[PDB]
Structures are given as structure tokens and as C-alpha cells.
């Protein structure tokens, strides 16, 4: 009822500019706490009279001056009423200043505040990061303000629409550097009170959102290179890392990608610099802070001699994603978090446009089908998903906000962006985005504003679409899910319906469009592209989809559109024979579509499961990477359902037969594993062949990965395992080995100097088959001295991936959830990801009981960021019980027969 | 002849590791800028080179505009100042697989 009890801010006060001064103490005080002292002065205009000031604040202690937590002053002759009392409302994280009188409309006011906070290792707000230089424990003060943690460093109106200018100041030790969004406004002047401390004031920022602020204080070095658009680029990181040259690669691509995005979207980069800094302790992968982008070390650094090609891809993709945010999210922000897909959906699509420019020989845009489209289809098929644009009233609390940073906003947004640019064409799509950026620069927008400017581009270019741009995209944005296109090639009929993994699931969400989509269908006939078609009705008919004799069709060419396709039994048979005759006749991207769609269709009871498994028969003579991966991905679901049952044995034998020819081929192609493929895709094919070969019991692989690891143990300094193979060779060699191999890989993980190497070691240690080792290793994941809090959740997710640890982690989660939730509430621990991963195997009514009881027990404690993930687990589990009962026998039959 | 080349990186914290060195100390043995370019008295003479080699940063003398290599006793006057009618073969400070900087020139004619 009260204003300060609601989670949304009042429109009465709107900020204009901020003055902030922070001072981190990188040493523990006598209480043992790393603290930071700060002072802030915010100038705001009163748009509506009110007798109370509501401003965000979180975990902040205020110095009392003039008997109150803040001091209110006037601007331009305005009379600030006396403050009656100030209070802190913890639930909604507010700082309520009750006044004796009301404020004048159209009058500016300034509010002073002196406060203190903790420089915790919770990777949120103004937090600390630590590393080791020689034998010294270096400490760093970094920042993570997304989504609503800027209130954790200084009081402000922490909302994306409350844009303003920030006059940042950083009081740090003399022997340390201070960085921020802008460049220093003159050199650092030693603080007069104490010459052991310097002061660095930074230039005023442009109109930006609070969640984009960043204040870093480190002793890092850097490497720089003036970009092609005059922007200064700097790659900050630990001294030893910079010296060894791990930042050189990011320096090579950052500049060019930045300038590429500038030209592609006809919009310059406003700021004079863009710093890329790599923290040792970061929660997410990276943050798009305007001017000072922050990265995980594994997302920015790269060692040409010990990093893998997939690590190099990670870096460029992450950099591109972050640099794209400079335009979509920073220059043009969202009105409210409910439209998060406008920032992360654009970046997740544009990340490929930039990466393809940096490394064009990689053809990375093709991987978007597997890494994005099908990554989100698995969750968007559930009735517990959410639309791309949830209503603003449905998102209010911080938990509900952090929850939206999921595959839907990232991947489905990217998939919708893919489908949009394919039927609009890139050159046209680029146009509308340029007008959309220029208009709403330094402002905030909603999904509607985008339709307006995209519709204009259709008018200038005279593009013909079945209807307005607003009405075609509203079908994919306002309502969740996606359709399944059922084709009757005998009669050329076309049908569509809401695809659900569990046909019995109860769709609760209402849709103004009643779950009917307007999909652009692209098809091919015997390997020849047909005329594009638009489906505006629930059921249609067209000659484009009719066949006769040997003629066969395939809809959704290169999977540009975000929808699954299913054909009649006859057409499937013609496709299967075509794959056995000459699979090269099918687009490599669509070969993956055939496998992925069929498997997900079987799960939906739309086609027999025996069909999907038949589509994986041609893989025995398949050399590409993408089709094999699509199968291994869909088959991972079979591993989850059957790796604790009689069905696994036969499954391993069938895979062991399908992959062995490829493994032998790469042994001859790689000169006995001495070299790697030149093409990046083939490099990944080699790895997927080695991992699948060893996981399924090919003894030649098992004898090789063990012999390599043993050679390494003999000469630890000289690692003979090529980076691309280290990931897979490590996991298998530790599972086959014993404690002597586990301790050696543990010794390596502690003494490691490269995070890419440590990450491979950390995961591989979770492959031990000994139950006592996994139990010991689990207790390590909660010791910040042994495993970084930023890697805790990940390491636990790796142990549960082990069939011997599946029950150990589930028991661990059930027993100490509250303790695990209270301690890591809103910190370095992601609860959604862990829930999603621990429940993946549930397939029995007993497990469903355990999960439903887990929900009932901890309903008082809550789940926050994992609420939706819990419901999705409950639905996916109920579906798994039916699926296994229905297919346990038929599947076992198919694996045993085709394994011979 | 015994050319000593050396250089130091931007000191302090927050240093730019690949920027142009902050200090340069190119010193030709038994050479006086004021007396003038010292010439090789005899074809029998030993020429050594002592460039800085720390980590990935190294200093070397690559002969560019002059068709003779420093270090070969076989087959002219050498100076650190511009001598007329002569070629300018520069002295560089290299960063492995990254940018490099010309810190000084060893002239010859
Ligand atoms: C913290 O502030 C102190 C004092 O401002 C900085 O120390 C001084 O930094 C300046 C700028 O780099 C240097 O000034 C020097 O002046 C001499 C003339 O005496 C001039 O020849 C140099 O070219 C240079 O401009 C000076 O080296 C340095 N003084 C010392 C020895 O401390 C300090 O750099 C600041 N620290 C940080 C991390 O900002
Ligand atoms: C579908 O995707 C395939 C693979 O990405 C595309 O095939 C490539 O086409 C380009 C020309 O655009 C050629 O230069 C490449 O050599 C092809 N790669 C192959 C076949 O290995 C194909 O163009 C895409 N088709 C459409 C129209 O989307
Ligand atoms: C911030 O600095 C700008 C430019 O110097 C100034 O106009 C503005 O009033 C300052 N704001 C505050 C709150 O100090
Ligand atoms: C702020 O005050 C609370 C007690 O009200 C205390 O527990 C907390 O440690 C204080 N913050 C800091 C940084 O000391
Ligand atoms: C799978 O193929 C086998 C023969 O290769 C056949 O016996 C079986 O009926 C097929 N299943 C379907 C439904 O395609
Ligand atoms: C320059 O190098 C020579 C090499 O011996 C050394 O003797 C001299 O002291 C150096 N001068 C500087 C700048 O220290
Ligand atoms: C170099 O030549 C000048 C000019 O005669 C004179 O200072 C002296 O001869 C030489 N100086 C040194 C340092 O030997
Ligand atoms: C960056 O580019 C430079 C020059 O093109 C190249 O020498 C260097 O190897 C590249 N850095 C890396 C490690 O990719
Ligand atoms: Zn992002």
C-alpha cells in the first residue's frame, strides 16, 4: 500500500546528474572485513509534488550528519523542506527520506550522503577480486552493477530509465591505478589528508543507465592500439598475463570489431575509449559497462600455446557480444527489464556478425543454429516458458529480474533476429536498425518502437510482406513458444500448431493470438531452393510442398526460421534413403535439422521414436562436425534417461559402432594425433570423435588418452596434449586412472597460471569414478581458498553430470539448500543453473516425489532466480516419466539390433 | 667495434607493456659524437652486439638499407649521427609477434 513497500520506483522524482566518490580499502580492518567508504551527491528534478524521497540502497551504512542519514539542499533558490526522519527498507532496498513539507514542481534538489559498505567477494556491486603475484596476495576492487546492484555501491535511482550523468571520483592507494567509464580528468593528485593515497577524478559520462557504471582499482598493466575509428582500445589484465601476451589476441580483434559495428549500423562510437579488463573473480562471462568492459579471464585472455580453438572462439564471440552491447543496450537502453531481449537478444545475434568479420575463415554464423536456436527450443517447448516480451507488471522484484537473463532472452531473441534478417535481408535489416538507433539515442525504448522504424525501412525499400511488421513480429514476441509445421507432401497441405515437448502439459499462459504464428517458410526440392512462402493461417495448402515419386522437400532452409518441421511418413523415407545414398546432397545445416527435429518430435509423440534413431544411421560415414554434434546433443537426452539402466550398454555399443570409422579416419588424417585439422569445424569434429569414441568404450582411444596423460605425468613441464584435446583427454584419463592421476591433475589446477587450463582441469577432476573422491572434491567446491566462488556452481554442475555423483549432489542439494541459499543469496551462486542440471536425470515417480517435496519444504525459503527453473524441472520430469515408460523397451530393441 | 643497445619499459604501475619504451640507451663503444664517424681501420676486427633480451622484449639490429650485416667480419664508417651519402639501417626494439619500435639508427657509408 505504501510507496516505499512497492518494488517499482515513483515517477515523482527523476535524477539529472550524480556526483560519486568511492574509496576502497584493499586491506582487512580489525573486524576482518574489506570495506569501502564513499560519498555521493545526486541532483534530481521534481516532476510531481511529494513529501518523501525514495531512492535505492542496498547493504550500505550511512554516516549521521545533522542528525540524519542524508542532507537535503536546494538548487536555483528552491527551499528544501526539513527532513523528519530517514529509514532503510530492506525488502525493496530503499532509502526513504520523510519530509515535513512537499517539494516544488519543476524545481531541482541535491541530496548529500556519506556511507560505508563491504568490499565482499559476492561478485555484486563494489566487490573485491583477488589473485596471486609471486607469493603476494594482490587485491582488486572491481564492479558488477547489472542488473540492480548499483544501489550496492552508492544510493541512486537504480532503474534503466533513470538515466543521468555521473561525475565519478576514486580515492585509491598511490601505487594502484583507478579506471572508470570515462578517462581521467587530469592526472592523479595525492590526497592531502594522506599522501599515501591518490585521487582520480573522471570526466562526466553521457546520459547512461546506472547498471552500466564501473569503478576498478588495480595494479594491472595493459596493451593498447589505436583503432581505425580513432577510439583508444586497451586490454587490461594481471601484469604477468599481459607480459606473457595473453591479451594480445583480444587487442587484435577488439579494435577491428568495434569499427566494424560502427560502420555496419551507420552509428559512431561516442566515447573516446573502450577498455577491456579481465578480472580474476567475475560472476558472469562479461559485462558491457560503457567505456570499461569487464570480462572473465577465460573470456578475454588467450595463450597461443596452451589455449584451445574453442577458447579462441569464446573470446571473439564474447568480445563481439560485449562490443555490440555498446549500441544495443548502452546507447539505446530498454524502458524496463521485461524487454531484456532488446539488449541481449540483439547482442546474441550481432555477436556473430562481428566475429565473422574478425575471423572470416571460421563461418561462425552457421554455428548459431546449434548454439542458439536449438539451445532454446528445448526450454521454449515447455508450457512453463515465457514470451520474449513479458508484461512490465509481471517483472518487479530483483529475483524476477535476474531470472530473465536466460536462454529465452539471449537465444530466442537471437533466433528471432536471425529469422527477421533472413526474410528482410541483411542490407534492409541494417537500414531499419540505423534509424532505430539514431532516433532513440541516449533514450529508452520498448518492442513497439522497433516495429515503427523497421516498418519504415520496409516502406523506403518497398519490401512486400503479408502485413505490417508490427503484426508479424508480435506473434513471436508477445506469446511464448514456437510452432511445428506439419507437411502433407502427398496433398501439399500445410498445418501448424503450438509445439510442446509434453503433449499433455497444461498451457496456462493466455495469448491474445491464441498461439498461432505467421511464419516465413523456405523450402528446397531435391537440393534446389524453391520460392519462399508465407503462412498466415492455421492451415493452408500450396503446390510448393507437393511431391511425386522420388521428389522430396525440406522446409526451413539452413534453419533461418524459428520453428520445427515435420513431414508425412512417406517423405521421411525419401529423406532417409537420400542420406544413405549421398548425404552431401542435403545442406549440412539441414542435416542437423533432420536429426534434431526428429528426436524432439519423438519426445512430443508426433513421430515414432524409431524414426529419429533411424536418422542417425547415416552418421557412420559422416565427416562434418555439425551433424554429429546435433545427434550427440539430442542423444545426450537418451544418456540422461538411460545411463543408469540396462539400456546404456547397448546405447554405448551403437555409438561405439557409428563413431569408430570417424575416429580411425582422424587418426590417419592427424598423423597419429600429431597435427590438427586446418579447418576449425574439422578440429571440433576431431574432438567430438575422440570424446564420443572414448566415452563409448573404443579401446584404441582409451589406450591413447591414458598413454598421453601418463607421458605428461613423466614430464609435467612439457604437456604433449594439444589444447583442443586436453579437455577430453583430461576427463577420460582421470576416470580410467585412480587417485594418483586425480592428485596430479589437482596439483596442476592449484599451480596453474592460465585460467583456460585450470577450467579444463577443474571439470576433468569431476570425472573420477570413485565415490569417495567425488565426495571430497564436492567439499572443495565450497572452500573459496580451493575453488573460486565464481566457479563453485560450475564445478558442482560437473559432478552431478557424473552418473556416480548424480545422487551425491541431489542429496547435497536436498539436505543443505537453505544453508546454501541463505549464505549465497544474490551472490556468486546461480541457483537456476544448478536446479536445471541436477533434475535433468529425473525419470521415475520416486524422483518426482523427491522434487515435489523439495519444492514444498523450501517454499518459505524461496527460490528467487530459480523459481521458473524449478517449475520447468517439474514439468520436464513429469514428461520424462511417461517418455521412459513408453520407449524403454522399443528403444532398447533398436540399440541392440543396430549395434551389431 | 662493440655496439651496446638497451632500453627500459614504461615504469610504475598501470604501465603500457607494448607502448614505445620510455628509456633508450644506444651506446657505440669508443665513439665520440664530436670527433666524428669512426672508421674501420683494418679489415681484421671483431664486431660484437649486446642488445637487451628480457622476456618477449628484445633488441636487435636489422640491416635494411645497407647491404652488409653487422656481426660479419668480412666485407665504410659507423656512427650514430647522420653521415652524408650513406644508408640508414635502423636499430629496433621488438615485441614477439607484436608491434616494434625504431629506437635509433646506426648509419654507415
Ligand atoms: C599518484 O600521484 C603522484 C603525485 O601526483 C604521482 O607521482 C608522480 O607522477 C607524476 C606523473 O606521472 C610524475 O611527475 C613527474 O615530474 C617530473 C619532474 O619532477 C617529470 O620529469 C616527469 O616527467 C613526471 O612528469 C612523477 O614521476 C611521480 N612522482 C613520484 C616519484 O611519485 C603518481 O604517479 C600517482 N600514482 C598513480 C598510480 O596515479
Ligand atoms: C546454407 O548454408 C550453407 C553453409 O553455410 C551455405 O553454403 C555456403 O555458401 C557459400 C556462398 O554463400 C559458399 O561460399 C560456401 O562455400 C558454402 N559452404 C559450403 C557449401 O560448404 C549456403 O549458401 C546457405 N544457403 C542459403 C541460401 O542460405
Ligand atoms: C557534473 O559535472 C558536470 C560538468 O562538469 C556539471 O555540469 C554537473 O553539474 C556536475 N554534477 C554534479 C552532481 O556535480
Ligand atoms: C553495516 O552495519 C551492519 C549492522 O547494522 C554490520 O553488520 C555491517 O558489517 C556494516 N557494514 C560494514 C561494511 O561494516
Ligand atoms: C528404421 O529403419 C529400419 C530398417 O533400416 C526399419 O526396419 C524400421 O521400420 C525403420 N523405422 C522407421 C519407422 O522408419
Ligand atoms: C648506457 O649503457 C652503457 C653500457 O655499458 C652503460 O655503461 C651506461 O651506464 C648506460 N647509461 C645509462 C643510461 O645508464
Ligand atoms: C669527445 O670530443 C670532445 C671534443 O674534443 C671532447 O669532449 C673530448 O675529446 C671527447 N669527450 C669524451 C667524453 O671523451
Ligand atoms: C596479433 O596480430 C599480430 C600482427 O598481425 C600477430 O603477429 C600476432 O600473432 C597476433 N596475436 C595473436 C596471438 O593472435
Ligand atoms: Zn549481453
Numbering used by the authors:
A (entry chain A): 68 to 967
B (entry chain C): 302 to 376, 383 to 416
What text comes from the article?
The coronavirus S-protein is responsible for both host receptor binding and fusion of the viral and host cell membranes. Its ectodomain is composed of the N-terminal S1 region that harbors the receptor binding domain (RBD) and the C-terminal S2 region that mediates membrane fusion. To address these questions and to gain further insight into how the 229E S-protein mediates membrane fusion, we determined the X-ray crystal structures of three additional RBD (Classes III, IV and V) complexes with hAPN, as well as the cryo-EM structure of the ectodomain of the S-protein trimer. We find that an invariant set of core interactions defines the interaction with hAPN across all the RBD classes characterized.
To gain insight into how loop variation is accommodated while maintaining receptor binding, we have now determined the structures of the Class III-V RBDs in complex with hAPN. RBD Classes III, IV, and V are from viruses that arose while circulating in the human population and they share important features that differentiate them from the tissue culture-adapted Class I virus. In Loop 2, they all have a deletion of two amino acids that allows Arg 357 of Loop 2, the last of the absolutely conserved residues, to form a stronger salt bridge with Asp 315 of hAPN than what was observed in the Class I complex. In Loop 3, all three classes have acquired two leucine residues not found in the Class I sequence: Trp 404 and Ser 407 of Class I are replaced by Leu 402 and Leu 405 in Classes III, IV and V. The sidechains of these leucine residues occupy the volume filled by the tryptophan sidechain in the Class I complex. As a result, Leu 405 makes the apolar contacts with Leu 318 of hAPN, a role played by Trp 404 in the Class I complex. The sequence changes in Loops 2 and 3 lead to a small re-orientation of the main body of the RBD in the Class III, IV and V complexes. This in turn leads to a compensatory twist in Loop 1 which preserves the core Loop 1-hAPN interaction. As a result of the twist, Arg 316 emerges from a different side of Loop 1 where it forms a salt bridge with Asp 288 of hAPN in the Class III, IV and V complexes, which is not possible in the Class I complex. The GGG motif (313-315) at the tip of Loop 1 in Class I is a GVG in Classes III and IV; the presence of the valine residue (Val 314) leads to an increase in the van der Waals contact with hAPN. The Class III, IV and V RBDs all bind hAPN with higher affinity than that of the tissue culture adapted Class I RBD (16-fold for Class V).
